[PDB]
């Protein structure tokens, strides 16, 4: 039977868990009854010892079972995410904000996950006067209408405000930082999941390979949680229930190698300018991130219904995401997206 | 610029900190500063990286700096401690305790650094209290003690008030932590000698270093059947520690007669169990819990002549085994107990 000496005494002996360890944990911790102390030993010792997709698997099952659901039937089965763990350190423009637009734009239903934060990505939906902060029926409605929606983390989990507050008094990087992306309270299949922790990334991908969904988790070797323009990205391709692990090289597809501070960002409104530009069709560096991040996302989505040939379903991907911009889509999306939350009034 | 992400960064990234970032923690967790979740955080990773005899150091003299001492000049510059991690999961007899008690009757002055059980079923507080002997004393009046019966008892919660929050974390958390290593390097009293069992395979090697930057005669002991104490089931390992310096060594008692025994035989149980072990120990009972007994003993009294060290290691073990059993056989034991009890309760 279960208790915290004898789950953190095998994690500080560096073993991994027994089946249903971590799950006991994470209801501990969900239901309130974990001490912030037991919580902070439990987060520190799985990270030090090094989760497996096993473990973070049951973290983010249970974490899903006391999520809020979107209502029955309204999220398309071909749904993707675009997100990543963020903790980079780096402080780019929200490139998986900006990328979820033009992918909606495209025609691929997009629902994303998220919080408050210079400038994270629900804060810049805000400046540019997204409504953020919408309950299960009204991001079901903005899906449908829309063809976006985006899920207020604190909103869908209330339940996890314990370990939340544990982290924030913790500060250092925890296993609990994989778990966004994995518990997305839509479900959708298919996704773009960025990962700031180069060996996490592996374990997120085992994670995704054993609900068998379609994702391409991935980690820019100039270690950003995103795919870069600056260096080649490290890719796991999941679907079919296996991990493919991959080097990709944009260089392949003509972009030029851009730098690191080409791509920085700002607080909310020098950040909603930037997308605002992106989606007005300006050309560059943040451009060329998009546009790849957007094409991965597609990607992905893809594999959902094929499997098709990796270097063509990428340039179809970006011939898509190019297409979403310059047609005026991703731009028309985002004012449409705009105009479905002024409406609940 | 110290901070907990910075410093817990640093040991989740398994590296050893930088010169005063343990004692820049210790110091806010024993001033209250440090959040629960920033004590526990800080306990396992330390555990986990490995913590260095650099960072105990710092952890203990910190903790040490915020301790009730003893008035100047009450503690013999001789005075030996006998005291473990606890920690080995074997549930024995009270080994230290009873150990204390031969030595001071042999005639050394013992300061003993102690508490209750954390995961057995009688630690040598409650052993102690089981007596009849006044564990709750503060320190003019544990001074006394020692001047008065040669032996006196400092409880660790009564000298070290500001330990309380890293404690409730320990209880709360439950795993051992570097913080179990703390209890025996911070006696309130700092006898410059002690027996320092280690239940700890790893680490007891860190609680030597500590030692050996004090000015400092111990021997740090690991039974190699996982005892906090000198075993007789088969070897021990032993860290002497002397002028600043540390010598290992495999240790075997069967190269002074003893036979082996089994952990069995050594198990204890309630206070009132191991309450009765005690006096049946002290009143001349034959029997491996004796053995245990007059060995580790002797090991205090080899650890007290290294502080004035003419003896050589093999006829300073001959001499603390005889002071051992005599203070036994002579009844000497039996009536320092008793005199012990009787201080007490004159008030
Ligand atoms: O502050 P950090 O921990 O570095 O994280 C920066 C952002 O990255 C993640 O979001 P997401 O990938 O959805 O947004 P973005 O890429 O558009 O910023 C995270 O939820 C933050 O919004
Ligand atoms: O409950 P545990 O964690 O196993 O610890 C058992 C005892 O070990 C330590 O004492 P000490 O060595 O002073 O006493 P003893 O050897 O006489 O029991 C500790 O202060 C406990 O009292
Ligand atoms: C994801 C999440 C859920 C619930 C509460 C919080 C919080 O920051 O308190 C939070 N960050
Ligand atoms: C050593 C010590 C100091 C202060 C409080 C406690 C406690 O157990 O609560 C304790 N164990
Ligand atoms: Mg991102
Ligand atoms: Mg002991
Ligand atoms: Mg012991």
Same mark, same amino acid.
């Given at each position: 039977?279960?208790?915290?000496?004898?789950?953190?005494?095998?994690?500080?002996?560096?073993?991994?868990?027994?089946?249903?360890?971590?799950?006991?944990?994470?209801?501990?911790?969900?239901?309130?009854?974990?001490?912030?102390?037991?919580?902070?030993?439990?987060?520190?010792?799985?990270?030090?010892?090094?989760?497996?997709?096993?473990?973070?698997?049951?973290?983010?099952?249970?974490?899903?079972?006391?999520?809020?659901?979107?209502?029955?039937?309204?999220?398309?089965?071909?749904?993707?995410?675009?997100?990543?763990?963020?903790?980079?350190?780096?402080?780019?423009?929200?490139?998986?904000?900006?990328?979820?637009?033009?992918?909606?734009?495209?025609?691929?239903?997009?629902?994303?996950?998220?919080?408050?934060? @210079?400038? =994270? &990505?629900?804060?810049?939906?805000? %400046?540019?006067? $997204? /409504?953020?902060? #919408? *309950?299960?029926?009204?991001?079901?409605?903005?899906?449908?209408?829309?063809?976006?929606?985006?899920?207020?983390?604190?909103?869908?989990?209330?339940?996890?405000?314990?370990?939340?507050?544990?982290?924030?008094?913790?500060?250092?990087?925890?296993?609990?930082?994989?778990?966004?992306?994995?518990?997305?309270?839509?479900?959708?299949?298919?996704?773009?999941?960025?990962?700031?922790?180069?060996?996490?990334?592996?374990?997120?991908?085992?994670?995704?390979?054993?609900?068998?969904?379609?994702?391409?988790?991935?980690?820019?070797?100039?270690?950003?949680?995103?795919?870069?323009?600056?260096?080649?990205?490290?890719?796991?391709?999941?679907?079919?229930?296996?991990?493919?692990?991959?080097?990709?090289?944009?260089?392949?597809?003509?972009?030029?190698?851009?730098?690191?501070?080409? @791509?920085? =960002? &700002?607080?909310?409104?020098?950040? %909603?300018?930037? $997308? /605002?530009?992106? #989606? *007005?069709?300006?050309?560059?560096?943040?451009?060329?991130?998009?546009?790849?991040?957007?094409?991965?996302?597609?990607?992905?989505?893809?594999?959902?219904?094929?499997?098709?040939?990796?270097?063509?379903?990428?340039?179809?991907?970006?011939?898509?995401?190019?297409?979403?911009?310059?047609?005026?889509?991703?731009?028309?999306?985002?004012?449409?997206?705009?105009?479905?939350?002024?409406?609940?009034?």
């Amino acid at each position: 039977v279960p208790s915290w000496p004898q789950i953190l005494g095998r994690l500080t002996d560096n073993r991994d868990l027994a089946r249903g360890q971590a799950a006991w944990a994470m209801d501990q911790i969900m239901t309130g009854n974990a001490r912030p102390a037991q919580i902070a030993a439990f987060a520190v010792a799985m990270t030090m010892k090094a989760p497996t997709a096993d473990e973070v698997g049951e973290l983010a099952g249970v974490m899903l079972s006391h999520a809020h659901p979107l209502p029955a039937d309204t999220v398309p089965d071909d749904a993707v995410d675009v997100v990543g763990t963020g903790g980079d350190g780096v402080n780019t423009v929200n490139l998986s904000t900006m990328a979820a637009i033009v992918v909606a734009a495209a025609g691929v239903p997009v629902v994303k996950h998220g919080n408050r934060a @210079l400038s =994270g &990505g629900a804060d810049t939906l805000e %400046a540019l006067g $997204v /409504r953020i902060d #919408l *309950g299960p029926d009204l991001v079901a409605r903005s899906l449908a209408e829309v063809g976006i929606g985006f899920c207020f983390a604190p909103r869908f989990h209330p339940s996890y405000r314990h370990a939340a507050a544990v982290r924030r008094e913790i500060g250092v990087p925890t296993v609990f930082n994989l778990l966004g992306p994995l518990t997305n309270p839509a479900r959708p299949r298919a996704g773009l999941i960025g990962c700031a922790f180069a060996d996490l990334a592996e374990v997120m991908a085992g994670v995704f390979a054993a609900r068998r969904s379609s994702v391409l988790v991935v980690h820019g070797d100039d270690g950003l949680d995103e795919l870069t323009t600056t260096t080649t990205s490290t890719i796991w391709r999941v679907a079919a229930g296996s991990v493919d692990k991959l080097t990709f090289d944009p260089a392949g597809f003509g972009f030029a190698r851009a730098q690191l501070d080409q @791509l920085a =960002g &700002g607080d909310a409104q020098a950040n %909603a300018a930037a $997308v /605002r530009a992106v #989606l *007005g069709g300006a050309r560059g560096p943040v451009r060329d991130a998009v546009v790849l991040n957007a094409a991965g996302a597609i990607v992905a989505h893809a594999g959902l219904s094929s499997r098709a040939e990796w270097l063509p379903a990428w340039e179809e991907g970006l011939r898509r995401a190019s297409a979403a911009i310059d047609t005026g889509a991703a731009e028309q999306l985002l004012a449409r997206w705009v105009r479905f939350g002024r409406q609940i009034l």
